[PDB]
Fold CMRF35-like molecule 6.
Amino acid sequence: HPMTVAGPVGGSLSVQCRYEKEHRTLNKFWCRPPQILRCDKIVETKGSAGKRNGRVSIRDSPANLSFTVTLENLTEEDAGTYWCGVDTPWLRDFHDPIVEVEVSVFPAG
């Protein structure tokens, strides 16, 4: 459930979030944690946020039971805690992470 990833300012990083067979068909998303119950989705594979949102993109690989989030042109602001998550078809009032991801951005050494 926990995960940490790191990359340089100006660079790229990718996060691979593994899930279960029952999640194959579900909308997958990337977000900062909820302020209350639901998080504000940055990108999603099957939803309003879109598969690409500026520097952030998401791609589902149901055959490998994972999806990958890619963050491009990293800035120090991009550091922090994120959720990989899935939505149920009829949706819930809350979100859970399938993985909590801590992103670190270090100066381009």
In short: The first strand starts at residue 2 and ends at 8. The chain has one domain: 2-106.
